[PDB]
Design a protein around this motif. Structure first.
Motif, mmCIF file in Angstrom:
data_model
loop_
_atom_site.group_PDB
_atom_site.id
_atom_site.type_symbol
_atom_site.label_atom_id
_atom_site.label_comp_id
_atom_site.label_asym_id
_atom_site.label_seq_id
_atom_site.Cartn_x
_atom_site.Cartn_y
_atom_site.Cartn_z
ATOM 1 N N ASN A 98 2.645 7.042 4.957
ATOM 2 C CA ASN A 98 4.008 7.021 4.399
ATOM 3 C C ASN A 98 5.144 7.257 5.427
ATOM 4 O O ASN A 98 6.180 6.605 5.328
ATOM 5 N N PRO A 112 -8.231 1.749 -1.043
ATOM 6 C CA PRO A 112 -7.564 3.057 -1.164
ATOM 7 C C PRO A 112 -8.431 4.264 -0.809
ATOM 8 O O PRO A 112 -9.625 4.125 -0.563
ATOM 9 N N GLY A 169 -7.096 7.381 -5.055
ATOM 10 C CA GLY A 169 -6.048 6.403 -4.829
ATOM 11 C C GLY A 169 -6.157 5.146 -5.654
ATOM 12 O O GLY A 169 -7.250 4.604 -5.830
ATOM 13 N N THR A 170 -5.009 4.679 -6.165
ATOM 14 C CA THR A 170 -4.899 3.441 -6.941
ATOM 15 C C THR A 170 -4.277 2.343 -6.063
ATOM 16 O O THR A 170 -3.773 2.638 -4.978
ATOM 17 N N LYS A 229 -1.661 0.817 -6.827
ATOM 18 C CA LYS A 229 -0.223 1.017 -7.012
ATOM 19 C C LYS A 229 0.347 1.938 -5.921
ATOM 20 O O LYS A 229 1.553 1.934 -5.682
ATOM 21 N N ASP A 230 -0.526 2.736 -5.268
ATOM 22 C CA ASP A 230 -0.169 3.637 -4.170
ATOM 23 C C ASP A 230 0.155 2.829 -2.915
ATOM 24 O O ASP A 230 0.988 3.248 -2.113
ATOM 25 N N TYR A 231 -0.518 1.679 -2.754
ATOM 26 C CA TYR A 231 -0.419 0.792 -1.599
ATOM 27 C C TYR A 231 0.502 -0.416 -1.824
ATOM 28 O O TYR A 231 0.495 -1.340 -1.010
#
Length: 233
Positions: free
Chosen positions: A213, A8, A12-13, A15-17
């Motif tokens: 995104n 990340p 960034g975690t 969970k973002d990816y």
């Protein structure tokens, strides 16, 4: 079967990816790397830097894949330097790295803000001096200070990061940039070609730093295609 490691960006975690990986939907294994943070908020970190954290990630990720088959690396922003450094440690162990996919991350030594010497406490004043700013507004102890350190520390690590010219990867590097990004541009992302002994390709996407995104199925398709083709056997 290939295992692709996802690194990340700064705050960034993994969970973002989740949506980034979802989209993969293929004959590719996806392992999201989580940085040892979890309230580790630290300013002026003597301990923290890019190769030191990369050494930690490597110690944590080495058991996840057997020393035989496929491994590909993807890193967005700060994760780009972390994925490169861990990919070097994987190659220095004969893990057969397929490729290295860098996204919105400048080539090592092609960062302009070399404020490595600048102390964390010192840096905020420097940010305060450029612009018309009330010294109290940012310098005061009310959180502005606490909220800033997770990002401030990352700035110092990136600024202080340097990779020697001969330390290169033995796999093709694939760079991805958002045409309206200024934290990383096509120009500073381009010298990544001096970080490999093989191929190199840069793809420009419409978007900024967070284009990922807006161009999710196109980006994952390229990563997926390139991963499979090198690994195919």
């Amino acid at each position: 079967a290939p295992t692709l490691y996802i690194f990340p960006h700064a705050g960034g975690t993994a969970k973002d990816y989740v949506a980034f990986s979802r989209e993969f939907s293929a004959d590719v294994k996806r392992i999201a790397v989580q940085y040892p943070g979890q309230h580790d908020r630290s300013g002026l970190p003597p301990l923290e830097s890019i190769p030191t954290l990369a050494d930690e990630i490597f110690a944590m990720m080495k058991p996840s894949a057997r020393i035989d088959d496929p491994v590909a690396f993807f890193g967005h922003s700060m994760g780009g330097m972390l994925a490169f450094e861990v990919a070097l440690r994987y190659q220095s162990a004969g893990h057969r790295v397929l490729a290295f996919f860098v996204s919105a991350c400048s080539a090592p030594g092609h960062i302009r803000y070399k404020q490595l010497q600048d102390l964390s406490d010192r840096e905020m004043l420097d940010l305060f001096t450029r612009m018309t700013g009330m010294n109290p507004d940012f310098f005061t102890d009310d959180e502005f200070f606490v909220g800033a350190l997770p990002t401030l520390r990352a700035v110092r690590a990136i600024a202080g990061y340097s990779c020697p010219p001969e330390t290169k990867l033995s796999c093709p590097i694939y760079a991805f940039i958002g045409d309206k990004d200024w934290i990383a541009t096509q120009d500073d992302m381009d010298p990544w070609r001096d970080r490999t002994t093989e191929e190199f390709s840069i793809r420009v996407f419409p978007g900024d730093h967070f284009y990922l995104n807006d161009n999710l199925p196109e980006l994952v398709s390229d990563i997926e295609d390139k991963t499979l083709q090198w690994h195919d056997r």
